[PDB]
Structure formats: structure tokens, C-alpha cells
Ligand binder design. Structure first.
Ligand SMILES: CNC(=O)[C@H](Cc1ccc(C)c(OC)c1)NC(=O)CSc1ccc2ccccc2c1-c1cncc(OCc2ccccc2)c1
Ligand SMILES: C=CCN1CC[C@]23c4c5ccc(O)c4O[C@H]2C(=O)CC[C@@]3(O)[C@H]1C5
Lengths: 286, 52
């Protein structure tokens, strides 16, 4: 009862804080006119995907104690789909945010042309469609089984069940790092080279400070996401090919890494609370 | 404590001999008259002006 209700305390804490922080972020972004910016649509999408991830934690909370998934088939399909929407959209929104910040900093004349909040909505819908094209086949082939002891959710790979599994693992790893992490590294490598030698960016000192603070905030959020999500990805690949044996520390490390990956959704509203002054003022006044 | 100092002058401005020498003897590190300077502490900090 000690470690058990401890773990349920962690579930309740993480789910409540993530849902409250992301709901407050959406509330302050939509209810204020001064928050409608080209880089607050991206944050809204980010705190949409984070709340989508966090909303599935109570179902795991119920599934841990009883040992059986008691909600049926449709909800199981939805949860398994929501995991892959969480991972893919959370990694693509950061990449598109960094490319936006690149356009803003190193191409001011062009970025003045096409950075309206009308463009950000179309980029968000295109990103979400591109993610959903891959995240829907996961809901195609996710079902509740009938195990020996208790019924559990699982991905049932259809014909050979050895080839498609490794295909999905390699595809997720290759895409959801090597495209966005390489794009983000190149974009920020160019941004720093511009920001080092520039006296002023937009001709006014206030515009300089407002243009540098947002870039620092976006870089801190990208670094937090990468540090939270790298160990589970590398550890999934190492379990895939290295064939690690069964050890008393290995399972606990695995469940730590997965817990860190879920815990990353909680942190971002807290970072936005004291990395942006306008967010802090809107949180306090509201 | 300065990321880089950009402009320096003997403002009274008689003439500001900036970091390149334009608008008319440099340091790299990471009749009463007064000389002003402009600088920022780091990359992410806004430009600010200092008086001697
Ligand atoms: C190929 N298999 C899959 O891909 C399914 C995909 C999948 C399957 C089933 C569900 C309900 C689901 O919801 C998102 C996702 N998922 C997994 O193999 C691993 S996830 C999982 C799933 C069911 C669980 C049931 C009971 C207990 C833990 C379960 C955990 C779990 C395991 N380890 C850690 C942890 O973290 C909780 C946490 C607590 C506090 C703070 C942060 C995180 C959760
Ligand atoms: C965000 C955390 C849950 N993740 C979804 C899918 C999965 C996963 C992740 C990363 C890469 C994969 O190929 C992969 O399949 C799964 C697996 O077998 C290990 C743990 C995960 O549940 C976890 C992160």
C-alpha cells in the first residue's frame, strides 16, 4: 500500500498539474488580444498535444491497480493512437517553431511579409495532417486481447508480426529524431551566428530585447524536450537489437525512462510561467 | 562582464569612432568631456548605454 498509493499519487499529481497548466495556457492565449502572435499559435498547438498526452494518465491509473483494462475496445484504440500523435506532433511543432524563429531573426524583410497568424493556422493543420497519416494506422491495429490472467491492450501486427514491428521502430526513430533534431540544430546554429555579431535586429532596442527573449525561451523548451525524450528512444533501440537480459535494475530503469517521457508534458507550462513576462502577468491577473 | 561593446564616443557628439571606424585600436573579449559606450552583457540581453 506504500509504494502502490505512492505511484497513484504520482499519477494524480502529474495528470492534474499537466491538465491545469495546459488549460490555463489555452485560456490565456485565446482570451487575450495581445497574445495572438505567430509564435503563440505554435505554443497553443504544443500545449494541445501535451494535454492530449496527459488526459490518458487516469486510464493507466485505473489499469495499474485492477490489472485489467476495463474500458473496452474503442478507448484502448484512442489511447494507443493518442500516444503516437503526442510523440510526432510534439516533435514536429518544435521544428516548425524553430524554423519560424529562423525566418524572424535572420530574414527580417521576408519575415515581415509572411508571419501573420493566418499562416500559422495553415502550418498547424498541415503538421497535424502529416502526423495523423502515420498515427492512424496505429489505431488500425491496436486491440484489447484476452490474456491468461488479465485483459490488456496491445498492438497486433497482422501478417508476419516480426517485420512490421521493426519497421515501425526504425521509422519512428529515424524520422522523429534525424529530421527534426538535425533541422533544429542547423536553424539554431545559424541563429547564434547572426545574434553574435548584430548590433540591433529590427532597428529599435525594445524590438531587440523582445526578439531575443523569445528565441531564448524557445531554445530552453527545445532543450527540455530533447533531454526528457532521448533516453526512452535510445533505450527502445538498444532493447530492439542489443537483446539485453532480464535484470533487477533494468526493468526499473526502463519504467523510469517511460515515466520521464510522460513527465515532460508537465514541465512546459511551468517554464512558460517565468520565461515570458506576458505569460506571467496573464497568469497572475487571471 | 561585457559580451561585446559596439559603439564608443566622446559625446558632448563630437565624433563616434565605432567598432569598425565608420561614421567618421580594437579589443576582442568574450574642457570637461565624457565618453559614452554601448554594450550588452550576453547574447540574450538587450543593448544598454553606459556613461563614464
Ligand atoms: C508496445 N506497447 C505499447 O505501445 C503500449 C501503448 C499503450 C498501451 C496501453 C495504454 C493504456 C496506453 O496508454 C497510453 C499505451 N505502452 C507500453 O508498453 C508502455 S506504457 C504503459 C502502458 C500500460 C500500463 C498499464 C499499467 C501500468 C503501466 C502501464 C504503462 C506504463 C509503464 N511504465 C511506465 C509508465 O508511466 C506511468 C507514469 C507515471 C508517473 C509519471 C510518469 C509516467 C506507464
Ligand atoms: C511517450 C511515451 C510512450 N511511448 C510510446 C511507444 C513506445 C515507443 C517510444 C519510442 C520509440 C518506439 O519505437 C516506441 O514503441 C513503444 C515501446 O515499445 C517503448 C515505450 C513507448 O510506449 C514510448 C516511447
Amino acid at each position: 500500500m506504500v509504494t502502490a498509493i505512492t505511484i497513484m499519487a504520482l499519477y494524480s499529481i502529474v495528470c492534474v498539474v499537466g491538465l491545469f497548466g495546459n488549460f490555463l495556457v489555452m485560456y490565456v492565449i485565446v482570451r487575450y488580444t495581445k497574445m495572438k502572435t505567430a509564435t503563440n499559435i505554435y505554443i497553443f498547438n504544443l500545449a494541445l498535444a501535451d494535454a492530449l498526452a496527459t488526459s490518458t494518465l487516469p486510464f493507466q491509473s485505473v489499469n495499474y491497480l485492477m490489472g485489467t483494462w476495463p474500458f473496452g475496445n474503442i478507448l484502448c484504440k484512442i489511447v494507443i493512437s493518442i500516444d503516437y500523435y503526442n510523440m510526432f506532433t510534439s516533435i514536429f511543432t518544435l521544428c516548425t517553431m524553430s524554423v519560424d524563429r529562423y525566418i524572424a531573426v535572420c530574414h527580417p524583410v521576408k519575415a515581415l511579409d509572411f508571419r501573420t497568424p493566418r499562416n500559422a493556422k495553415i502550418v498547424n493543420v498541415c503538421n497535424w495532417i502529416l502526423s495523423s497519416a502515420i498515427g492512424l494506422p496505429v489505431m488500425f491495429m491496436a486491440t484489447t486481447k484476452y490474456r491468461q490472467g488479465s485483459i490488456d491492450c496491445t498492438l497486433t501486427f497482422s501478417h508476419p508480426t516480426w517485420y512490421w514491428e521493426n519497421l515501425l521502430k526504425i521509422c519512428v526513430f529515424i524520422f522523429a529524431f534525424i529530421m527534426p533534431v538535425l533541422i533544429i540544430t542547423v536553424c539554431y546554429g545559424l541563429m547564434i551566428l547572426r545574434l553574435k555579431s548584430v548590433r540591433l535586429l529590427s532597428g529599435s532596442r525594445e524590438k531587440d530585447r523582445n526578439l531575443r527573449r523569445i528565441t531564448r525561451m524557445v531554445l530552453v523548451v527545445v532543450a527540455v524536450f530533447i533531454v526528457c525524450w532521448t533516453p526512452i528512444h535510445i533505450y527502445v533501440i538498444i532493447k530492439a537489437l542489443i537483446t539485453i537480459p532480464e535484470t533487477t535494475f533494468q526493468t526499473v530503469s526502463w519504467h523510469f525512462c517511460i515515466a520521464l517521457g510522460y513527465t515532460n508534458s508537465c514541465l512546459n507550462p511551468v517554464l512558460y510561467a517565468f520565461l515570458d513576462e506576458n505569460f506571467k502577468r496573464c497568469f497572475r491577473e487571471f | 562582464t561585457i559580451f561585446r561593446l559596439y559603439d564608443m564616443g566622446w559625446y558632448r557628439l563630437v565624433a563616434s569612432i565605432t567598432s569598425g571606424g565608420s561614421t567618421k585600436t580594437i579589443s576582442r573579449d568574450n574642457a570637461v568631456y565624457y565618453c559614452n559606450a554601448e554594450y550588452r552583457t550576453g547574447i540574450w540581453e538587450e543593448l544598454l548605454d553606459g556613461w563614464g
